[PDB]
C-alpha cells in the first residue's frame, strides 16, 4: 500500500517546478499535508479492506486525492475557519445549546428565497441546526419526495438555482444555524445520466449499478432480502423495458449504485466534496445499511458498508474537517449503533427511542422505554444520538425482539397491537394515523401521520397537547441533538389532499407531509389555542435546554420510579426528569424518593417541589427537577 508522503509528491506533479515551489510553501498545502499524514492511514486501511488488490484501487485513489487537494484549495476561507474550529471541538454535536429542525423547502416556504425569509422564525424558535429535504433535480411526478436524484449538482428548478442555495446557506450561517442536507449515496434515479449511460453500455459507466440478464441471480438474492416498499415491487429488483433486471431496494425508479466498483466510490466522494464546499455542515447519510451486497446475506449492515462510510469520513477529515455525518439506519438496535463512531458517523438517528415513545403512549407502560434508556442510550466519546418524535417517514417498530422477550413481550404480537392502535383500529384509541406498507406475506406494517394526528389533536382530545409536550420533552432532555419536525410546534394535522392525488395516493407518508399552515402559525402566541399552547411549551423547554448546563452531553442514568407508568432518568447527576405516560394521575412515593434532596425546583412548571412526601403527577405531566 502507498504511503501519504509518496502520494503527496505525485499530487504536486501537475505543477511546473516554479509553481510547485510556491504550492509547497502555501498555507493551504501545509494544512492539507498535515491532515493527510494524520488521516490517510485510515483511508487506505478502509479502502484496502473493501477493494483489496483490485487493480483500480491505486489509480482511483490517486485521482481522488488529486481532486481532494483541488477541492480544499478552492474551499472558501470562512469554511476553512470552521474546519479548524471543529477539528479542536469534536463535541460540538453534544452541546445542550444544539436544537434542530427539519422541513421541505416547497411545503414549508414555497422556494429557497421563501425559506430565507423564514430564517427569522427559526431564530425565534431557537434552532441552531436545519435539515432541508432533497433539493436537487429529480423525476417529475414521482420521485420519492426528491430521494430519486437525477442530478447531484442542479437544483430542482421549482425551488430555485444553485446560487439561491448558496445564499440560503450563507444566511443560515449568519443566523447561527448549521445547514444539513441529504447525501443520497446508495442510489440515483433511473433518469440520472450515470444510469442512462450504464444501461446503454457506455464503457465509462460499466458496472455502476447491478444489472442482470434474467431472474437467475435476482431470485437467489431475493431468498434473503427484506422488502422496504412491498407495495411497489416484490424483492429487491425491477425489470427494464429491454427485459433485464436491476437492483432497486426502494422504488423501481431508484437504482442502487454499485460500490463493488472503486470508480463508484470515487464518483460519490467527488459529490461529497461538492456539497462540502457549498458550506454544508452535516450530511445525512441516506440508506447507509444497503451500500454493500453479498449473496446469501440480507445485504444490510455488511462489514464493507461500515468500511466505506469510514473511508468517506477520512476524506472529509482531509479535505473538509467541518463536515460531519448523520447516519440514517432504521434497523435492529444492535446494528443501529454500529454506524455511530467518531471515525464513521459522528451522529445518527435514534429510532429506538422514537418508536418506544409512541409505544409507551399506547401501552401506558414505560417498561420497554426504561430498558432502552438503561442499556442502549450511552454512546462512545465524541458521538451523539439525534433524538426525534416524528420525521418525513413512517414510524417503524424497530425495538429488539430479544429485549422484549426478556420482559415477557412477544415482538410480533406487540407490533400487531401498535399498528392497530395507531391507525384507529383498536377500541378507545386516540390515534388517527394511516397504514404504510402492510406486507401480507410477513404481517409487518408501519404508521403514517403527524405527531398531532397520532396524539388525538384532530378530534380535540383534551390530552393531545400534553402528549405532544411529553414526547418532545424526552427528545429534548435525554442527551443528544433533538430534531423537531417543523409544523409539530403548532400542532399541524395530516395533509387533506394526498389520498386523492395520483402522484401521492399510493404512498401514505404524504399524510404527514402537510404544507405550512398559516392559520396555526398565526395563533402561536395565543395561549388559548392548541397552537399557542404547544408552541409556548416547546419554546420554553428549548430555552431551558439551551441555557441550563445540566442538560449538556449525551449520557444518562435511569431512575427506578417504582410506578410502571412513570419514566425517570438523571442527567449529569443534577437533573431528575419524570414523565407520566398515563392519562390518570400517577404517584412516585416518598419511600422511593428518600435519597433525594427534600426540595427541588421544577424547570417545567417553575414551582418548588417537595420530595420528602408522595409526588403526584397529573396526566402526562413532565417534571425537570434540579437535584444539584
Ligand atoms: Na510534472
From Swiss-Prot:
Q: What is the effect of changing residue 393 to E?
A: Almost complete loss of activity
- Where does the record place the catalytic residues? 286, 328
EC number(s) from the headed UniProt entry: 2.4.1.4
Q: Indicate the principal place this protein occupies in or around the cell.
A: secreted
Q: Which positions does the site annotation Transition state stabilizer cover?
A: 444
- Subcellular localization: Secreted
The entry's cellular-component GO terms read: extracellular region
Residues that bind substrate: 144, 187, 254, 284, 392-393, 509
Q: Which GO terms describe its molecular function?
A: amylosucrase activity
| CDD domains found in the cross-reference section | AmyAc_Amylosucrase
Give the catalysed reaction(s), semicolon-separated.
[(1->4)-alpha-D-glucosyl](n) + sucrose = [(1->4)-alpha-D-glucosyl](n+1) + D-fructose
Keywords assigned: Glycosyltransferase, Secreted, Transferase
Write down the InterPro entries for this protein, in alphabetical order. Amylosucrase, Amylosucrase_C, Glyco_hydro_13_cat_dom, Glyco_hydro_b, Glycoside_hydrolase_SF, O16G_dom_2
Q: How is its activity regulated?
A: Amylosucrase favors hydrolysis at low sucrose concentrations, and polymerization at high sucrose concentrations. Competitively inhibited by fructose.
Q: What else is known?
A: Like the recombinant protein expressed in E.coli, the amylosucrase may be secreted in N.polysaccharea without cleavage of a signal sequence.
As for family, the record states: Belongs to the glycosyl hydrolase 13 family.
State the protein's purpose: Catalyzes the synthesis of alpha-glucan from sucrose. Catalyzes, in addition, sucrose hydrolysis, maltose and maltotriose synthesis by successive transfers of the glucosyl moiety of sucrose onto the released glucose, and finally turanose and trehalulose synthesis, these two sucrose isomers being obtained by glucosyl transfer onto fructose.
Q: Return the protein name.
A: Amylosucrase
The UniProt gene name for this protein comes to ams
Amino acid at each position: 500500500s502507498p504511503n501519504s508522503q509518496y502520494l503527496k509528491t505525485r499530487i504536486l506533479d501537475i505543477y511546473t517546478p516554479e509553481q510547485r515551489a510556491g504550492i509547497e510553501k502555501s498555507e493551504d498545502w501545509r494544512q492539507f499535508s498535515r491532515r493527510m499524514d494524520t488521516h490517510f492511514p485510515k483511508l487506505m486501511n478502509e479502502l484496502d479492506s473493501v477493494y483489496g488488490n483490485n487493480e483500480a484501487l491505486l489509480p482511483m485513489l490517486e485521482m481522488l486525492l488529486a481532486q481532494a487537494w483541488q477541492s480544499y484549495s478552492q474551499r472558501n476561507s470562512s469554511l476553512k475557519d470552521i474546519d479548524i474550529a471543529r477539528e479542536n471541538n469534536p463535541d460540538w454535536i453534544l452541546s445542550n445549546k444544539q436544537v434542530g429542525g427539519v422541513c421541505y423547502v416547497d411545503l414549508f416556504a414555497g422556494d429557497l428565497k421563501g425559506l430565507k425569509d423564514k430564517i427569522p422564525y427559526f431564530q425565534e424558535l431557537g434552532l441552531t441546526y436545519l435539515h432541508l429535504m432533497p433539493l436537487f433535480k429529480c423525476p417529475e411526478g414521482k420521485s420519492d419526495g426528491g430521494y430519486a436524484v437525477s442530478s447531484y449538482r442542479d437544483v430542482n428548478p421549482a425551488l430555485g438555482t444553485i446560487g439561491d442555495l448558496r445564499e440560503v446557506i450563507a444566511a443560515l450561517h449568519e443566523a447561527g444555524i448549521s445547514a444539513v442536507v441529504d447525501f443520497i449515496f446508495n442510489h440515483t434515479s433511473n433518469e440520472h445520466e450515470w444510469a442512462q449511460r450504464c444501461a446503454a453500455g457506455d464503457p465509462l459507466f460499466d458496472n455502476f449499478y447491478y444489472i442482470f440478464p434474467d431472474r437467475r441471480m435476482p431470485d437467489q438474492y431475493d431468498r434473503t432480502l427484506r422488502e422496504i416498499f412491498p407495495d411497489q415491487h416484490p424483492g429487491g429488483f425491477s425489470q427494464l423495458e429491454d427485459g433485464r433486471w436491476v437492483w432497486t431496494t426502494f422504488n423501481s425508479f431508484q437504482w442502487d449504485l454499485n460500490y463493488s466498483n472503486p470508480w463508484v466510490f470515487r464518483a460519490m466522494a467527488g459529490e461529497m466534496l461538492f456539497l462540502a464546499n457549498l458550506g454544508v455542515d452535516i450530511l445525512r447519510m441516506d440508506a447507509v445499511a444497503f451500500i454493500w451486497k453479498q449473496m446469501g446475506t440480507s445485504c444490510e449492515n455488511l462489514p464493507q458498508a461500515h468500511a466505506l462510510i469510514r473511508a468517506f469520513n477520512a476524506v472529509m477529515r482531509i479535505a473538509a474537517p467541518a463536515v460531519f455525518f448523520k447516519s440514517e439506519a432504521i434497523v435492529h438496535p444492535d446494528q443501529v449503533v454500529q454506524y455511530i463512531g467518531q471515525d464513521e458517523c459522528q451522529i445518527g438517528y435514534n429510532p429506538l427511542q422514537m418508536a418506544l415513545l409512541w409505544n409507551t403512549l399506547a401501552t401506558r407502560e414505560v417498561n420497554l422505554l426504561h430498558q432502552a434508556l438503561t442499556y442502549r442510550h450511552n454512546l462512545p466519546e465524541h458521538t451523539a444520538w439525534v433524538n426525534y418524535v416524528r420525521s418525513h417517514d413512517d414510524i417503524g417498530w424497530t425495538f429488539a425482539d430479544e429485549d422484549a422477550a426478556y420482559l415477557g413481550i412477544s415482538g410480533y404480537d406487540h407490533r400487531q397491537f401498535l399498528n392497530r392502535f395507531f391507525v384507529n383500529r383498536f377500541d378507545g384509541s386516540f390515534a388517527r394515523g394511516v397504514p404504510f406498507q402492510y406486507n401480507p406475506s410477513t404481517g409487518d406494517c408501519r404508521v403514517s401521520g403527524t405527531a398531532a394526528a397520532l396524539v388525538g389533536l384532530a378530534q380535540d382530545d383534551p390530552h393531545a397537547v400534553d402528549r405532544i409536550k411529553l414526547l418532545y420533552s424526552i427528545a429534548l432532555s435525554t442527551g443528544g441533538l433533538p430534531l423537531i419536525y417543523l409544523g409539530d410546534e403548532v400542532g399541524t394535522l395530516n395533509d387533506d389532499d394526498w389520498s386523492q392525488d395520483s402522484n401521492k395516493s399510493d404512498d401514505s407518508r404524504w399524510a404527514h407531509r402537510p404544507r405550512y399552515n398559516e392559520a396555526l402559525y398565526a395563533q402561536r402566541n395565543d395561549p388559548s389555542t392548541a397552537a399557542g399552547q404547544i408552541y409556548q411549551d416547546l419554546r420554553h423547554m428549548i430555552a431551558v435546554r439551551q441555557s441550563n448546563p445540566r442538560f449538556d452531553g449525551g449520557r444518562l442514568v435511569t431512575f427506578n420510579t417504582n410506578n410502571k407508568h412513570i419514566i425517570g432518568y438523571i442527567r449529569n447527576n443534577a437533573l431528575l426528569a419524570f414523565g407520566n405516560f398515563s392519562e390518570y394521575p400517577q404517584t412516585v412515593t416518598a419511600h422511593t424518593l428518600q435519597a433525594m434532596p427534600f426540595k427541588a425546583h421544577d424547570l417545567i412548571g417553575g414551582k418548588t417541589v417537595s420530595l420528602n412526601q408522595d409526588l403526584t403527577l397529573q396526566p402526562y405531566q413532565v417534571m425537570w427537577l434540579e437535584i444539584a
